[PDB]
Amino acid sequence: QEKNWSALLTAVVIILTIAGNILVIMAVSLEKKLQNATNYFLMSLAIADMLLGFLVMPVSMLTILYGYRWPLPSKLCAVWIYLDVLFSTASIMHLCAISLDRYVAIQNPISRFNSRTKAFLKIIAVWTISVGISMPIPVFGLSKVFKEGSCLLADDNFVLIGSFVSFFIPATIMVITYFLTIKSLQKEAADLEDNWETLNDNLKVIEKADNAAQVKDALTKMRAAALDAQKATPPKEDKSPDSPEMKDFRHGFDILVGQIDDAKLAKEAQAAAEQLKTTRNAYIQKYLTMQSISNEQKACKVLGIVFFLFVVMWCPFFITNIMAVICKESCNEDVIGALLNVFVWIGYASSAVNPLVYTLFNKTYRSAFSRYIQCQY
Numbered sequence: 001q002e003k004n005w006s007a008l009l010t011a012v013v014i015i016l017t018i019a020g021n022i023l024v025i026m027a028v029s030l031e032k033k034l035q036n037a038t039n040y041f042l043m044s045l046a047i048a049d050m051l052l053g054f055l056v057m058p059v060s061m062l063t064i065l066y067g068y069r070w071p072l073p074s075k076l077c078a079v080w081i082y083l084d085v086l087f088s089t090a091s092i093m094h095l096c097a098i099s100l101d102r103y104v105a106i107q108n109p110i111s112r113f114n115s116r117t118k119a120f121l122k123i124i125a126v127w128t129i130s131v132g133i134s135m136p137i138p139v140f141g142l143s144k145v146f147k148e149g150s151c152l153l154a155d156d157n158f159v160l161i162g163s164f165v166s167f168f169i170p171a172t173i174m175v176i177t178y179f180l181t182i183k184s185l186q187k188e189a190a191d192l193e194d195n196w197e198t199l200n201d202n203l204k205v206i207e208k209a210d211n212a213a214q215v216k217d218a219l220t221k222m223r224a225a226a227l228d229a230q231k232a233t234p235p236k237e238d239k240s241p242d243s244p245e246m247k248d249f250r251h252g253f254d255i256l257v258g259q260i261d262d263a264k265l266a267k268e269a270q271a272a273a274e275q276l277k278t279t280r281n282a283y284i285q286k287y288l289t290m291q292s293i294s295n296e297q298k299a300c301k302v303l304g305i306v307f308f309l310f311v312v313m314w315c316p317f318f319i320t321n322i323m324a325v326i327c328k329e330s331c332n333e334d335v336i337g338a339l340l341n342v343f344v345w346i347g348y349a350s351s352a353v354n355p356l357v358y359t360l361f362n363k364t365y366r367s368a369f370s371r372y373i374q375c376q377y
């Protein structure tokens with residue numbers, strides 16, 4: 001009938017998340033360019049989301065196909081449901097521990113005791129938080145996990161409480177922190193970017209000024225604006241090999257400022273002491289900070305459009321899940337179950353959306369997937 005087009009639509013969704021997600025795990029592992037804590041999470045997230053594709057998602061087709069009668073042994077219906085919420089709790093935990101992590105960095109300035117396993121240590125808490133949450137599925141699992149001979153999370157309380165714990169507080173939390181980070185990190189840009197205007201403009205005046213005292217009043221602020229940038233160079237956590245080069249860059253290019261301040265003592269060589277238009281060093285810190293701003297504005301676009309698609313697709317299922325129990329007396333739960341049947345597969349296809357966002361908006365992801373698709377290393 002009409003269902004003949006949508007019959008296998010689930011299988012497209014099982015095929016995309018079991019594969020296209022899988023490459024994301026491959027790509028982050030194989031290519032050294034994508035070795036970042038915020039692209040580390042995505043790999044872990046991708047496992048949660050992939051694991052859901054090859055474990056939970058197959059049985060939902062078997063059950064949808066059987067008429068929703070439970071086909072398997074009754075003792076294993078409290079397990080398929082367990083993985084499903086675990087992974088789905090794990091999946092949103094990864095997404096919300098990407099904004100709690102990335103909001104943290106703009107609030108708190110900085111030494112890294114643990115280095116590049118700041119993520120792997122974080123990640124384990126993301127998973128072990130979600131395994132903690134899902135202990136109750138098998139704790140009471142073996143009853144209240146069957147309704148009219150279908151495998152269905154029928155515990156009224158877990159349905160209600162566990163919709164917030166694994167959806168509305170994680171997703172609320174991330175929405176809040178995603179937008180505070182954007183506004184905050186939009187602001188840092190303007191503050192840092194307006195310094196190089198000050199540095200260049202104030203250096204224009206020193207260049208074309210014939211009063212020694214004018215240069216003194218003019219070049220005084222060059223130290224200030226350079227320092228403000230120095231304080232404000234972005235976290236992007238803070239790696240051990242890159243921040244020293246900025247320290248040397250800031251310090252080494254501060255010498256030009258500081259030295260030219262003396263030559264205060266006195267204008268013959270003041271004009272030419274601050275000629276950091278001759279020095280290679282000064283030119284790099286523009287490029288290699290101004291790139292670093294644009295590599296955070298791109299990541300925020302992807303994360304916004306990954307957060308948003310994940311919230312907007314799981315939200316139907318959870319809103320009517322609660323409705324199944326918050327409107328127990330008045331709703332028609334042949335209809336709510338019908339609606340619930342289909343809002344999980346709206347939601348189950350947020351597990352495929354991630355890799356497509358990456359290829360669409362990350363040139364590094366795009367190139368590797370085809371190379372993995374074509375089997376090139």
Ligand SMILES: CC(C)CCC[C@@H](C)[C@H]1CC[C@H]2[C@@H]3CC=C4C[C@@H](O)CC[C@]4(C)[C@H]3CC[C@]12C
Nearest residue numbers: 040043044045047048086119120123124127131
């Ligand atoms: C059975 C319980 C633990 C529920 C979770 C399922 C299992 C399979 C979980 C437990 C801990 C998880 C791992 C924790 C550590 C890492 C390293 C990290 O950089 C990426 C994900 C990865 C590789 C996870 C993969 C999935 C994983 C092994």
Ligand SMILES: CC(C)CCC[C@@H](C)[C@H]1CC[C@H]2[C@@H]3CC=C4C[C@@H](O)CC[C@]4(C)[C@H]3CC[C@]12C
Nearest residue numbers: 315316319320323327330331332333335336339
């Ligand atoms: C996409 C998102 C916003 C979906 C929101 C779904 C929630 C708010 C709504 C949408 C569909 C709704 C159900 C639609 C139809 C019925 C049948 C009726 O006899 C009882 C109410 C009941 C069961 C509604 C309960 C509330 C409900 C579950």
Ligand SMILES: CCN(CC)C(=O)[C@@H]1C=C2c3cccc4[nH]cc(c34)C[C@H]2N(C)C1
Nearest residue numbers: 081084085088152153158159162163166344
């Ligand atoms: C149609 C019947 N099925 C299929 C197993 C469900 O109701 C599953 C149970 C859900 C569920 C209940 C209660 C709390 C929760 N947290 C996270 C989920 C969750 C995920 C959610 N999965 C997607 C489907």
Ligand SMILES: CCCCCCCC/C=C\CCCCCCCC(=O)O
Nearest residue numbers: 015018019022025026027029372373
């Ligand atoms: C659903 C069809 C699967 C097609 C796979 C496409 C690319 C082929 C890659 C291998 C699939 C399984 C990967 C397991 C080893 C991953 C390698 C690694 O990440 O270190």
